[PDB]
Amino acid sequence: MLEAKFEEASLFKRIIDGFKDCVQLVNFQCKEDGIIAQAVDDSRVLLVSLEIGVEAFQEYRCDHPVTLGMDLTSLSKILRCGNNTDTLTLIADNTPDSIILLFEDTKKDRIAGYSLKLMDIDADFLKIEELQYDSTLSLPSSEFSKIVRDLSQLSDSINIMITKETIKFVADGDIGSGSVIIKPFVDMEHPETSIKLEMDQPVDLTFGAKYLLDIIKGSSLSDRVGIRLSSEAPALFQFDLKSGFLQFFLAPK
Amino acid sequence: MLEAKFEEASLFKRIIDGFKDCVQLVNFQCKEDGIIAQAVDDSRVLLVSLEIGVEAFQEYRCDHPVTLGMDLTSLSKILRCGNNTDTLTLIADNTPDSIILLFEDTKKDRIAGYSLKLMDIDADFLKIEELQYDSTLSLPSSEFSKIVRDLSQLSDSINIMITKETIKFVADGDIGSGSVIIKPFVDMEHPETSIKLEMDQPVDLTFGAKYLLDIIKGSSLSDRVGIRLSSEAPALFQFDLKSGFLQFFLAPK
């Protein structure tokens, strides 16, 4: 048996939102300390990686390991029906054919439950090693969205350059041309607004805008996003959850 | 989908307690206005009949009719695990192979769920008609237990006679012999303790003690029990629930 209950259904919706647009079928591997879910883009360009620990749930129980392979387009249509402020409880038995999603509001005395047919996903193992990066930075995730959403109009590629106190984004296409420079800064009154940069080595990297358009969809999960960049390895984008994260690994062109 | 949630798991335990000892396999027929479950004794002597309306649950949802055929010995072993003060939620999908029982305590942040395999019961339809009875009476259900438990030791049969202000029980066997006479009475300060009798016609009936031993197991569900007796028809024993009842129909020897 598995019982994983979110205080706010919304949390789970937004988790599925960072995923559904760039991968369709994902296994969710539940065990005693919580859930990880990890998927590749088809084209092997984008790896997505979720961790939700026990502490993220209102109440959680998983005595024996289960894999919940579920279609995110389907899952997402069921999640659409929940009030975004409801209780969400996931329930699945020992060897599951199905998952049960149960929206509950103890205030209004309203209860709803939906059933989602699990499927056999059979994905490639993902070997995600822990690395050292040339540069590390954080900023409000919504500042990151706005830059990505704006420059994306102009080019399929966005170039990111990091130099001593400079984070530079550039997009150059057929119609137009964009350039944004942000500087690390400490915000006395509002530290959540700060841009932090830690640079061991300058970096200069190009990424497909389409993939950055996918990653910025993790934004609703966290005020801030952490970007780790390196000349040899894929870049890493991370949105911290209360007791977990959503990570994207992206390869430069 | 079906979601039927009891504020107190205990209510459901005691409901299953009035049943499990005299019938093993019962269908529970859920629909929009709630659940009825009805079973015969093998020997066709004892009919059991449950009604639980919507108002009996904390929250209830059943849009489409489902039959939950379940083994009460099994069901009862799962129910044993619940804290008697917990939340119990029953969940079953559209066409169910299984039922899910979910014990929850929002105070301790403890959650447990168990799965029970439904089975195909195939019972006889029960034609339960509404009748006129010679005599009708109520009394504390626990007074009824004590009389039945005591006289049962002495004889496989208990004789019940009703005359103008007299309710008489008699048991006569090989070892011993018992006689209890209770008189209708109004209890000023404590009306729940009253014995009420309404007699249209005297009655004189014998019943198998074993079957009365089964019926008095409905006692934990209600302070009072109503007994309706007639010379032509089976006797009717009823424990009222908050918005339903548990009935037993019993044929005299």
Side-chain angles (χ1 to χ4, degrees):
Chain A
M1 217 66 175
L2 163 86
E3 303 81 50
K5 189 207 191 71
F6 294 93
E7 170 161 10
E8 311 260 35
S10 92
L11 185 70
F12 199 57
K13 319 248 213 82
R14 298 178 315 188
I15 298 193
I16 293 321
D17 291 343
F19 255 110
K20 64 152 188 281
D21 280 305
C22 67
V23 205
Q24 255 203 283
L25 318 180
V26 64
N27 290 318
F28 285 75
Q29 294 160 357
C30 324
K31 39 180 158 134
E32 314 195 294
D33 52 355
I35 319 178
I36 84 186
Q38 307 184 334
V40 215
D41 213 52
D42 263 308
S43 346
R44 281 178 170 202
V45 193
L46 226 204
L47 301 88
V48 203
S49 187
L50 171 68
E51 264 194 46
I52 336 179
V54 179
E55 212 47 43
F57 301 89
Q58 205 177 76
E59 61 216 8
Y60 175 83
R61 176 141 178 189
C62 190
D63 292 339
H64 301 282
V66 266
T67 292
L68 277 19
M70 35 187 170
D71 180 351
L72 305 177
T73 315
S74 290
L75 168 64
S76 199
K77 267 151 201 196
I78 286 149
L79 261 21
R80 209 144 296 271
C81 310
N83 287 109
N84 199 96
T85 225
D86 279 348
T87 261
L88 182 60
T89 309
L90 303 183
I91 308 151
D93 65 343
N94 205 270
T95 70
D97 278 355
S98 277
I99 189 186
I100 284 160
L101 306 90
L102 180 96
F103 302 100
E104 177 182 354
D105 185 15
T106 40
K107 281 177 173 190
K108 289 275 208 68
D109 276 339
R110 285 152 196 201
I111 192 96
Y114 297 83
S115 197
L116 177 64
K117 225 274 204 203
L118 298 181
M119 34 194 80
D120 211 282
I121 272 76
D122 269 335
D124 290 13
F125 185 86
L126 287 77
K127 193 178 158 103
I128 292 140
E129 51 273 287
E130 278 153 15
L131 306 178
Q132 300 289 299
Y133 292 93
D134 295 318
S135 301
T136 300
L137 62 150
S138 40
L139 67 163
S141 54
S142 78
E143 185 171 9
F144 190 59
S145 284
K146 285 162 188 188
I147 293 156
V148 171
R149 272 151 65 80
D150 184 9
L151 301 188
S152 273
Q153 310 191 100
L154 304 165
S155 179
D156 285 310
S157 299
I158 304 189
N159 185 18
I160 304 199
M161 292 168 265
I162 294 187
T163 61
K164 288 197 200 192
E165 285 289 300
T166 308
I167 311 141
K168 192 177 180 176
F169 308 80
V170 180
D172 190 57
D174 293 321
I175 57 168
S177 196
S179 176
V180 177
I181 294 150
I182 55 180
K183 292 225 87 160
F185 83 99
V186 173
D187 187 351
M188 190 260 95
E189 162 184 31
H190 279 122
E192 342 98 26
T193 307
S194 299
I195 299 166
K196 308 201 266 259
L197 168 59
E198 204 198 356
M199 189 195 79
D200 295 341
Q201 218 55 48
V203 289
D204 181 341
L205 303 175
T206 311
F207 292 107
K210 67 179 286 197
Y211 298 117
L212 298 167
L213 280 163
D214 280 343
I215 287 158
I216 75 170
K217 280 154 174 178
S219 298
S220 54
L221 296 160
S222 184
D223 293 337
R224 291 186 65 81
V225 53
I227 306 166
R228 300 173 237 172
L229 302 171
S230 76
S231 61
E232 310 313 305
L236 184 194
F237 302 69
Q238 180 168 334
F239 305 88
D240 286 344
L241 307 155
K242 212 199 82 173
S243 282
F245 56 67
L246 170 74
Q247 280 180 353
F248 302 85
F249 293 82
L250 182 60
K253 298 182 140 165
Chain B
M1 217 66 175
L2 163 86
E3 303 81 50
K5 189 207 191 71
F6 294 93
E7 170 161 10
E8 311 260 35
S10 92
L11 185 70
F12 199 57
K13 319 248 213 82
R14 298 178 315 188
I15 298 193
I16 293 321
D17 291 343
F19 255 110
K20 64 152 188 281
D21 280 305
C22 67
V23 205
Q24 255 203 283
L25 318 180
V26 64
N27 290 318
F28 285 75
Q29 294 160 357
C30 324
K31 39 180 158 134
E32 314 195 294
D33 52 355
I35 319 178
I36 84 186
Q38 307 184 334
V40 215
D41 213 52
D42 263 308
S43 346
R44 281 178 170 202
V45 193
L46 226 204
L47 301 88
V48 203
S49 187
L50 171 68
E51 264 194 46
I52 336 179
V54 179
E55 212 47 43
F57 301 89
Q58 205 177 76
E59 61 216 8
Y60 175 83
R61 176 141 178 189
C62 190
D63 292 339
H64 301 282
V66 266
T67 292
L68 277 19
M70 35 187 170
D71 180 351
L72 305 177
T73 315
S74 290
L75 168 64
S76 199
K77 267 151 201 196
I78 286 149
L79 261 21
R80 209 144 296 271
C81 310
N83 287 109
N84 199 96
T85 225
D86 279 348
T87 261
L88 182 60
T89 309
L90 303 183
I91 308 151
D93 65 343
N94 205 270
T95 70
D97 278 355
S98 277
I99 189 186
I100 284 160
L101 306 90
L102 180 96
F103 302 100
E104 177 182 354
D105 185 15
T106 40
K107 281 177 173 190
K108 289 275 208 68
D109 276 339
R110 285 152 196 201
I111 192 96
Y114 297 83
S115 197
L116 177 64
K117 225 274 204 203
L118 298 181
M119 34 194 80
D120 211 282
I121 272 76
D122 269 335
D124 290 13
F125 185 86
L126 287 77
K127 193 178 158 103
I128 292 140
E129 51 273 287
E130 278 153 15
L131 306 178
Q132 300 289 299
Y133 292 93
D134 295 318
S135 301
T136 300
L137 62 150
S138 40
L139 67 163
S141 54
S142 78
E143 185 171 9
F144 190 59
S145 284
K146 285 162 188 188
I147 293 156
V148 171
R149 272 151 65 80
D150 184 9
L151 301 188
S152 273
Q153 310 191 100
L154 304 165
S155 179
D156 285 310
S157 299
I158 304 189
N159 185 18
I160 304 199
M161 292 168 265
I162 294 187
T163 61
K164 288 197 200 192
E165 285 289 300
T166 308
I167 311 141
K168 192 177 180 176
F169 308 80
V170 180
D172 190 57
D174 293 321
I175 57 168
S177 196
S179 176
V180 177
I181 294 150
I182 55 180
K183 292 225 87 160
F185 83 99
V186 173
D187 187 351
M188 190 260 95
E189 162 184 31
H190 279 122
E192 342 98 26
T193 307
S194 299
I195 299 166
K196 308 201 266 259
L197 168 59
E198 204 198 356
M199 189 195 79
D200 295 341
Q201 218 55 48
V203 289
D204 181 341
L205 303 175
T206 311
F207 292 107
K210 67 179 286 197
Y211 298 117
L212 298 167
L213 280 163
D214 280 343
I215 287 158
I216 75 170
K217 280 154 174 178
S219 298
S220 54
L221 296 160
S222 184
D223 293 337
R224 291 186 65 81
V225 53
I227 306 166
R228 300 173 237 172
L229 302 171
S230 76
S231 61
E232 310 313 305
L236 184 194
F237 302 69
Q238 180 168 334
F239 305 88
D240 286 344
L241 307 155
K242 212 199 82 173
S243 282
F245 56 67
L246 170 74
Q247 280 180 353
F248 302 85
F249 293 82
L250 182 60
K253 298 182 140 165

